[PDB]
Amino acid sequence: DQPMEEEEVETFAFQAEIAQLMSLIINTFYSNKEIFLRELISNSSDALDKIRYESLTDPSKLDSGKELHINLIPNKQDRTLTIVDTGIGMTKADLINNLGTIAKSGTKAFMEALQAGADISMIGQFGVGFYSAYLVAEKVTVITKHNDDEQYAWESSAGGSFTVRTDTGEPMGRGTKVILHLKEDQTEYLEERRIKEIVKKHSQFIGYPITLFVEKELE
């Protein structure tokens, strides 16, 4: 009897400083956790800038999709909030290199800044705003598709390690989906009014369409 599907899964250890940062973020009390959404939307915007830039000299880069946008998808039943863009996306090497195994100088620098009295809301200036997801999420899954490459899924519950595998569930044209599996006491970020007010407050200058899709699985 053959399996419906099979995926090779790799587990990698986080670089020491990244593990340190994740533990600080996911455990420490902060009063302004809503900034995570600003940081994720900012990373979407950057990724959309990148594919747009590439398309200026090579229009075929948009064969995987011309529309450049950001979607926000709360799912109360799964207790997940997902941010999706049609940006440049990432290769497997990109995921392994840029989401865990190699720590840029900004990682240690950010933790130093916090020790010196800086606020968590500055985290994007250090290039590690992604990890602010763990302010509100117990687990984060990143599904990504780059041109000419297959679709991958990165995942971590911040245990000091993350996994990478091929993802074949729902094929994306191009871009990145960040799925936040929210902590039990952070479900306010699934509410329409909360999402709207955070986007209005922090993302006014993002130069791409941002669209809410409220998700409900029907009985």
| Binding-site annotation, residues for ATP | 43, 85, 104, 130
CB of 146 to ligand 3RR, least distance (A): 8
The 147-176 site mask, x for binding ligand 3RR (CB under 6 A), equals -----------------------------x
Instruction: Assess 203 for contact with ligand 3RR (CB under 6 A).
Output: no
Q: Between 80 and 176, whose beta carbon lies closer to ligand 3RR?
A: 176
Q: Between 22 and 190, whose beta carbon lies closer to ligand 3RR?
A: 22
Q: Between 178 and 199, whose beta carbon lies closer to ligand 3RR?
A: 178
Instruction: Assess 81 for contact with ligand 3RR (CB under 6 A).
Output: no
Half-sphere exposure (Cβ direction) of 64: Cα atoms closer than 13 Å: 24
Whether the CB-CB separation of 195 and 74 falls below 8 Å is answered with yes
Question: Cα separation of 217 and 178, whole Å?
Answer: 20
Q: Assign residue 193 a region (left: φ > 0; alpha: ψ between -120 and 50; beta: otherwise).
A: alpha
Q: Between 22 and 219, whose beta carbon lies closer to ligand 3RR?
A: 22
Near ligand 3RR in 131-150, by CB under 6 A:
142
CA torsion angle 76 80 86 91 (round to 10): -160
Question: Cα separation of 54 and 182, whole Å?
Answer: 34
